[PDB]
Design a protein around this ligand. Structure first.
Ligand SMILES: *[C@@H]1O[C@H](CO)[C@@H](O[C@@H]2O[C@H](CO)[C@@H](O)[C@H](O)[C@H]2NC(C)=O)[C@H](O)[C@H]1NC(C)=O
Ligand SMILES: *[C@@H]1O[C@H](CO)[C@@H](O[C@@H]2O[C@H](CO)[C@@H](O)[C@H](O)[C@H]2NC(C)=O)[C@H](O)[C@H]1NC(C)=O
Ligand SMILES: *[C@@H]1O[C@H](CO)[C@@H](O)[C@H](O)[C@H]1NC(C)=O
Ligand SMILES: *[C@@H]1O[C@H](CO)[C@@H](O)[C@H](O)[C@H]1NC(C)=O
Ligand SMILES: *[C@@H]1O[C@H](CO)[C@@H](O)[C@H](O)[C@H]1NC(C)=O
Ligand SMILES: *[C@@H]1O[C@H](CO)[C@@H](O)[C@H](O)[C@H]1NC(C)=O
Lengths: 49, 104, 50, 171
């Protein structure tokens, strides 16, 4: 644990990026987290929503 | 600021996204008990140490540097005089040697 | 348990007693500090809309 | 406690996890802050039974044993002067009593051994002699203190008394 001070910085930043990327798998209330599924399934007036 | 103890020097080492400092310090060891006094009374005059502190081994008085025990004879060359022996609290009676005396 | 804050120690204080080191040790200690982070960058439009 | 809301909340990803982690990090830091300031001694130093420091009185900063909290007169003054929604408060690792103990160890160390305990072993020195060294530090010869010891002790003792009077009054 001698160099925990430096490792902690690396770990915190890696964690932040992993979270940022994982959020792209969330729906946020949308029918799908995948943008292509929305465009393929719905006509423009509904896809935009 | 630069490690525990009395700072002597430091050496940098580089590290991944950071720096490591190796701090070299002086640490006192193996202390001994001595009897002390604020001043020495001689010829009605109060003598104070110029650099160190007055200590006694139980029978004899010496003056030594503060951070390392290295006892020396109390002389006019390592003390200074200020005032008489009436003011200082805890002043003790001890001869102060004058290096010129043996010459004259 | 209730933690202790360290060993108890009382200094042999008196009005005419002094302690003086007769020896010393050279000690070397290490101190580690962070200086920088990974320089990340994100393309907003690409992240959001691909 | 609504299941319908909870199921909808899950669709927003890990926002809640991030928020919980941020607050946990702060809570931990608060104990690190206290530890760094107060826990600077590896030993708990005690003052002598006989408070003879050459006329220098420290009774207002040293622990008062008549108090259950074992706080000084000044500390006691300082302390007197200053869920339904899933909100909680966590206790500090160190209690007020433990912090007070650290402070008293620092005071006992300074009074009996000057600065030596902060850089190694605690080495006893007469308080008047410690002050004499501190006078040298500021470019004043030692004899100035020894020849004015009563005056210096009196000025010191009065200054400390003024501190308590100021704090107890100024709102
Ligand atoms: C000051 O301390 C040093 C150790 O830090 C002493 O040196 C050691 O002395 C012992 C014998 O008593 C040897 O066996 C060790 O090998 C020595 N160590 C080193 C690094 O030399 C030194 O003698 C002490 N000085 C005095 C006056 O006691
Ligand atoms: C150190 O100072 C304190 C505070 O001035 C002294 O306590 C006072 O002592 C007198 C005489 O017994 C009492 O009448 C006061 O009421 C005390 N004041 C407080 C706040 O308690 C204490 O006596 C002094 N110690 C020495 C050795 O002089
Ligand atoms: C100095 O004397 C005290 C007792 O008054 C003793 O406890 C302490 O260990 C002594 N210090 C040394 C270095 O011998
Ligand atoms: C004090 O030092 C002197 C000079 O070295 C020596 O003659 C004397 O015996 C010492 N006294 C004691 C108690 O060691
Ligand atoms: C120490 O206190 C005693 C009284 O117990 C006194 O006679 C002596 O002169 C004092 N010494 C110093 C250095 O203050
Ligand atoms: C020091 O010596 C003087 C005489 O030169 C004497 O009057 C005085 O009482 C002595 N002080 C002590 C503490 O013995």
């Amino acid at each position: 644990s001698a160099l925990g001070k430096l490792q902690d910085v690396v770990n915190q930043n890696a964690q932040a990026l992993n979270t940022l990327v994982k959020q792209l798998s969330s729906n946020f209330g949308a029918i799908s987290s995948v943008l292509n599924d929305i465009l393929s399934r719905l006509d423009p007036p509904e896809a935009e929503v | 600021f630069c490690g525990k103890g009395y700072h002597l020097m430091s050496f940098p080492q580089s590290a991944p996204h950071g720096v490591v400092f190796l701090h070299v310090t002086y640490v006192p060891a193996q202390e001994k008990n001595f009897t002390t006094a604020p001043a020495i009374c001689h010829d009605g005059k109060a003598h104070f140490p110029r650099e160190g502190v007055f200590v006694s081994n139980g029978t004899h008085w010496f003056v030594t540097q503060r951070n390392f025990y290295e006892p020396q004879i109390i002389t006019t060359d390592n003390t200074f005089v200020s005032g008489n022996c009436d003011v200082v609290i805890g002043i003790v009676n001890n001869t102060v040697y004058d290096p010129l005396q043996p010459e004259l | 348990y209730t933690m202790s804050l360290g060993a108890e120690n009382s200094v042999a204080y008196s009005n005419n007693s002094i302690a003086i080191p007769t020896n010393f040790t050279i000690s070397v200690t290490t101190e580690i500090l962070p200086v920088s982070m990974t320089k990340t960058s994100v393309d907003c439009t690409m992240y959001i809309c691909g | 406690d609504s299941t319908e809301c909870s199921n909808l909340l899950l669709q927003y990803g890990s926002f809640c996890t991030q928020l919980n982690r941020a607050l946990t990090g702060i809570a931990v830091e608060q104990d690190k802050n206290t530890q760094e300031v107060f826990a600077q001694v590896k030993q708990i130093y005690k003052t002598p039974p006989i408070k003879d420091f050459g006329g220098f009185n420290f009774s207002q900063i040293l622990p008062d044993p008549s108090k259950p909290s074992k706080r000084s007169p000044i500390e006691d003054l300082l302390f007197n002067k200053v869920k339904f929604n899933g909100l909680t408060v966590l206790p500090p690792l160190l209690t007020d009593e433990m912090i007070a103990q650290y402070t008293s160890a620092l005071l006992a160390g300074t009074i009996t051994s000057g600065w030596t305990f902060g850089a190694g072993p605690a080495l006893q020195i007469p308080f008047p002699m410690q002050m004499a060294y501190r006078f040298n530090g500021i470019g004043v010869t030692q004899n100035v203190l020894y020849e004015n010891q009563k005056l210096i002790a009196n000025q010191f003792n009065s200054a400390i008394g003024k501190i308590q009077d100021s704090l107890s009054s100024t709102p």
